[PDB]
Design a binder for this molecule. Structure first.
Ligand SMILES: *[C@@H]1O[C@H](CO)[C@@H](O[C@@H]2O[C@H](CO)[C@@H](O[C@@H]3O[C@H](CO[C@H]4O[C@H](CO)[C@@H](O)[C@H](O)[C@@H]4O)[C@@H](O)[C@H](O[C@H]4O[C@H](CO)[C@@H](O)[C@H](O)[C@@H]4O)[C@@H]3O)[C@H](O)[C@H]2NC(C)=O)[C@H](O)[C@H]1NC(C)=O
Ligand SMILES: *[C@@H]1O[C@H](CO)[C@@H](O[C@@H]2O[C@H](CO)[C@@H](O[C@@H]3O[C@H](CO[C@H]4O[C@H](CO)[C@@H](O)[C@H](O)[C@@H]4O)[C@@H](O)[C@H](O)[C@@H]3O)[C@H](O)[C@H]2NC(C)=O)[C@H](O)[C@H]1NC(C)=O
Ligand SMILES: *[C@@H]1O[C@H](CO)[C@@H](O[C@@H]2O[C@H](CO)[C@@H](O[C@@H]3O[C@H](CO[C@H]4O[C@H](CO)[C@@H](O)[C@H](O)[C@@H]4O)[C@@H](O)[C@H](O)[C@@H]3O)[C@H](O)[C@H]2NC(C)=O)[C@H](O)[C@H]1NC(C)=O
Ligand SMILES: *[C@@H]1O[C@H](CO)[C@@H](O[C@@H]2O[C@H](CO)[C@@H](O[C@@H]3O[C@H](CO[C@H]4O[C@H](CO)[C@@H](O)[C@H](O)[C@@H]4O)[C@@H](O)[C@H](O)[C@@H]3O)[C@H](O)[C@H]2NC(C)=O)[C@H](O)[C@H]1NC(C)=O
Ligand SMILES: *[C@@H]1O[C@H](CO)[C@@H](O[C@@H]2O[C@H](CO)[C@@H](O[C@@H]3O[C@H](CO)[C@@H](O)[C@H](O)[C@@H]3O)[C@H](O)[C@H]2NC(C)=O)[C@H](O)[C@H]1NC(C)=O
Ligand SMILES: *[C@@H]1O[C@H](CO)[C@@H](O[C@@H]2O[C@H](CO)[C@@H](O[C@@H]3O[C@H](CO)[C@@H](O)[C@H](O)[C@@H]3O)[C@H](O)[C@H]2NC(C)=O)[C@H](O)[C@H]1NC(C)=O
Ligand SMILES: *[C@@H]1O[C@H](CO)[C@@H](O[C@@H]2O[C@H](CO)[C@@H](O[C@@H]3O[C@H](CO)[C@@H](O)[C@H](O)[C@@H]3O)[C@H](O)[C@H]2NC(C)=O)[C@H](O)[C@H]1NC(C)=O
Ligand SMILES: *[C@@H]1O[C@H](CO)[C@@H](O[C@@H]2O[C@H](CO)[C@@H](O)[C@H](O)[C@H]2NC(C)=O)[C@H](O)[C@H]1NC(C)=O
Ligand SMILES: *[C@@H]1O[C@H](CO)[C@@H](O[C@@H]2O[C@H](CO)[C@@H](O)[C@H](O)[C@H]2NC(C)=O)[C@H](O)[C@H]1NC(C)=O
Ligand code: NAG
Ligand code: NAG
Ligand code: NAG
Ligand code: NAG
Ligand code: NAG
Ligand code: NAG
Ligand code: NAG
Ligand code: NAG
Lengths: 53, 132, 53, 53, 43, 132, 132
């Protein structure tokens, strides 16, 4: 299974207080796409068939 | 270096063998009995619990006059009420686990009888030696 | 003219309790049971090597 | 107890006692400072002038 | 440049926050997923 | 089920009895000696302290050549300087607590004498056996 | 009060003496082996570690049939392969530390040989006694 988030996220540091750092999601570079996971259809089908048996 | 290895008598792997055959590997398990701030305390507690268990077993062995000996004969007669059987089928056919399962009921009375016999023997020996 | 504590961008300090004394006191280190502490009595010992006393 | 006829090899630099007692001192210092007052509110802007006194 | 299936999933949120000095405050912006913010009831 | 119970030799309840009469219940107390993150640590420390006390007592018994025996005679003579008395009034009239109170002064010298005698006996036995 | 003091056989201060001469002070060190929430736990762990070390040593002594004895002869022959030497130069010229340094290589095989010999002796004694 291949799980991917293709968004080019950026980390931004904010000083909340003394030695307190907060990491926030800054502007995304480029296109924005939904994170998705891929599996092999044939392999999943054969595994489901074995499970069914 | 001709293909040799260790071939050492290890853990309870011999438990499935017979009574007498498994009596070979008592000492290795006896030695294994002492194999060796929220998690270190728990592991230390486990170690201390194992230590108390082994020390209590040693104290029980010493109370029956069998300290320092893996095998120690005693003067308590073997009443046939517990399990009659016979010697031949015990030490050559039955395993240790089956024997423990069979005799698990009357262990405490055996311990008490061994205690009383050892105390009486100690007093009799003291009196006899003081006589000489 | 505006100034800030030097530590404000690093961490927050913990003021020491006034009743607590910073004066050093003699201390001894003792080995537990089963261990021993060896002292080299040689007056010309240079910190390493053999010691006969 | 003096050990007659005994020669021992000493090494000041590769001694575990020095590191161990350094760590012990650091931990004891931190433990002593733990119950004391936490000086976080001091991190505020200060108006400072010179001292002609 | 959000795809059709990512409409409203991401939200650009700006807010005030304390800085290293308590008396001072800073206005900062970030991005939060829709499953991390809830509306409170124009603006 | 005819009115029977336990009637077991328990705790120090026999301490008020005489010397010889109280010698019956030594082993039960010996067994009792091992009865069994701010409070668990304290109870674990108490358990470990009891363990060290019992183990130190066992080590002292072994050093005098009396390991594994509740009663063990020794080769050290009984000097009359400590408490002369006589045998009849000791084992039939005086209790264990009174004897401990009387002989509490010279315990360390007794321990040292037993130590030295056992060491000498061990060396003499080793030499005699090596002779054969 | 005529200038007397203690003059007690203390710590390893006798280690520099010869083999036989240093055998006098074995028991004092044996007794010393049990001398006695972020720091108390560490010191308790040190105490428990010392306890396990001593108890493991006692278990090893008991496994070889030498429990309760500082000196215990055994039936294992002394193979000359380890260190031939001779008796005269060992117990009168060499110290304990030098002997430990020399024989540090083959300690495990000695332990195993003593184990096997003691087990065989125990079984032979059990069979012989059951014969009578
Ligand atoms: C989430 O929402 C926040 C606000 O809440 C957005 O942050 C703002 O983003 C905009 C758009 O990029 C920023 O505006 C740009 O900022 C840059 C700096 O501008 C300087 O110069 C101008 C005057 O020239 C000053 O007013 C300004 O203060 C700065 O000193 C430049 O990239 C841009 O200027 C260029 O474009 C403009 C467009 O018209 C031209 O007029 C200019 O001449 C020049 O070519 C522009 O000003 C804005 O500054 C950001 N604000 C903050 C506080 O950061 C996030 O972008 C948004 N996130 C997402 C993912 O949408
Ligand atoms: C697990 O259980 C197995 C089945 O009981 C055990 O096998 C036994 O292994 C022992 C030795 O460990 C054998 O004892 C030997 O047996 C023969 C005696 O002759 C008889 O058996 C042979 C072969 O079965 C047969 O041809 C003859 O006619 C006799 O019936 C001799 O070699 C020796 O004297 C010795 O007694 C058992 O015979 C054997 N039992 C079998 C194969 O049923 C096995 O050892 C167990 N595993 C463990 C780890 O203990
Ligand atoms: C607490 O102390 C009590 C007082 O000493 C103990 O009572 C004693 O109990 C023992 C047995 O445990 C008795 O021993 C028996 O005594 C008689 C001997 O005859 C003499 O005593 C009787 C009755 O007092 C008297 O009639 C005779 O003339 C003699 O003087 C026989 O039955 C036996 O042979 C045996 O020796 C003591 O006599 C008795 N002492 C008394 C009553 O003063 C009591 O046991 C103690 N408690 C504990 C728990 O140890
Ligand atoms: C540290 O090592 C020292 C050197 O080996 C040890 O000194 C030895 O001490 C022992 C007693 O503990 C002596 O043994 C006695 O020696 C003589 C035998 O006569 C021979 O020696 C004398 C004096 O050296 C000499 O005049 C003669 O001609 C002989 O050569 C007798 O008094 C006794 O029978 C007994 O055997 C050693 O002789 C002595 N060795 C020396 C001085 O070289 C010292 O004890 C060691 N320290 C510890 C704490 O063990
Ligand atoms: C998981 O599977 C999906 C669906 O197959 C993959 O999405 C597909 O990815 C490929 C390769 O990047 C895309 O092809 C490319 O698309 C554009 C537009 O033509 C361009 O960059 C290239 O010329 C090329 O054709 C494809 O469009 C895209 N979508 C579909 C529906 O097939 C995805 O990449 C897979 N993820 C992983 C981690 O393997
Ligand atoms: C998940 O991603 C992995 C890589 O991270 C994919 O495995 C890769 O699949 C490609 C084809 O899509 C393989 O390339 C082909 O491989 C062989 C020779 O190795 C041959 O058929 C072709 O010449 C071509 O090069 C690639 O080797 C393979 N990599 C590994 C490490 O196995 C996988 O297919 C992805 N899974 C899904 C469900 O999309
Ligand atoms: C962060 O802090 C700033 C600074 O205090 C806040 O800005 C203030 O927001 C209030 C409420 O919207 C403003 O009051 C209104 O302003 C205008 C002009 O008078 C008008 O709509 C109303 O009559 C009302 O007075 C206030 O002026 C404004 N202050 C400044 C200096 O801009 C801000 O709301 C806080 N929060 C965020 C997320 O930025
Ligand atoms: C916290 O602030 C102090 C004081 O300004 C910083 O120390 C200075 O850092 C600058 C960085 O350009 C150096 O040029 C100066 O030489 C530093 N001054 C001294 C006295 O050391 C410090 O770097 C800041 N810390 C962080 C983590 O930003
Ligand atoms: C911004 O996104 C919001 C949602 O966060 C949009 O408002 C509606 O959201 C619901 C789901 O909550 C959708 O079904 C509607 O289609 C959305 N639109 C309307 C008009 O109701 C909102 O439209 C988006 N755009 C703006 C400019 O705020
Ligand atoms: C899976 O395999 C079966 C045969 O085993 C086939 O009939 C079917 O079309 C395949 N695909 C799915 C989605 O079931
Ligand atoms: C043990 O006793 C049983 C029951 O009487 C008998 O069948 C069996 O042969 C005996 N085993 C012997 C004598 O070895
Ligand atoms: C032990 O006692 C239980 C009841 O407590 C009984 O069911 C079991 O059969 C007994 N086992 C034997 C071996 O007598
Ligand atoms: C967003 O989309 C617009 C319209 O297609 C395009 O001109 C612009 O470059 C895009 N921005 C980014 C950052 O890709
Ligand atoms: C013990 O000695 C005392 C004091 O001489 C004497 O009175 C008493 O009878 C003795 N006890 C005996 C001999 O049992
Ligand atoms: C023990 O010694 C103390 C003084 O240390 C003395 O008062 C007491 O009488 C002594 N006890 C005996 C039984 O001699
Ligand atoms: C021990 O053996 C060596 C080497 O042969 C010899 O020189 C020495 O005299 C021997 N020691 C004795 C016999 O005491
Ligand atoms: C012990 O073995 C090491 C190598 O493991 C070797 O260097 C050393 O000489 C050996 N010692 C003895 C006394 O044989």
């Amino acid at each position: 299974i291949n799980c991917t988030r293709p968004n080019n996220n950026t980390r931004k540091s904010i000083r909340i207080g003394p030695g307190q750092a907060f990491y926030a999601t800054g502007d995304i570079i480029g296109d924005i796409r939904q994170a998705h996971c891929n599996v092999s259809k044939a392999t999943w089908n054969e595994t489901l068939g074995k499970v069914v048996k | 270096a001709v293909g040799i290895g260790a071939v050492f008598l290890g853990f309870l792997g011999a438990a499935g063998s017979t009574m007498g055959a498994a009596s070979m590997t008592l000492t290795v398990q006896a030695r294994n009995l002492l194999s060796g701030t929220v998690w270190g305390i728990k592991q230390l507690q486990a170690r201390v619990l194992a230590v108390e268990r082994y020390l209590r077993d040693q104290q029980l062995l010493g109370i029956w006059g069998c300290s320092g000996k893996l095998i120690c004969c005693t003067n308590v007669p073997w009443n046939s009420s517990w399990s009659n059987r016979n010697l031949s089928e015990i030490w050559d056919n039955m395993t240790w686990l089956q024997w423990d399962k069979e005799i698990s009921n009357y262990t405490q009375i055996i311990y008490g009888l061994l205690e009383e016999s050892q105390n009486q023997q100690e007093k009799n020996e003291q009196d006899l030696l003081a006589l000489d | 003219k505006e100034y800030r504590l030097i530590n404000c961008n690093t961490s927050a300090c913990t003021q020491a309790c006034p009743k607590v004394s910073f004066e050093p006191i003699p201390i001894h280190y003792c080995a537990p049971a089963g261990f021993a502490i060896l002292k080299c009595k040689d007056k010309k010992f240079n910190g390493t090597g053999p010691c006969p006393s | 107890i003096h050990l007659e006829n005994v020669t021992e090899e000493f090494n000041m630099w590769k001694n575990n006692m020095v590191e161990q007692m350094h760590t012990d001192i650091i931990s004891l210092w931190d433990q002593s400072l733990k119950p004391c007052v936490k000086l976080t509110p001091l991190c505020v802007t200060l108006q400072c002038t010179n001292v002609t006194n | 440049n959000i795809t059709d299936d990512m409409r409203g999933e991401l939200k650009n949120c700006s807010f005030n926050m304390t800085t290293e000095l308590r008396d001072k405050k800073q206005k900062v912006y970030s991005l939060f997923y829709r499953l991390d913010v809830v509306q409170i009831n124009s603006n």
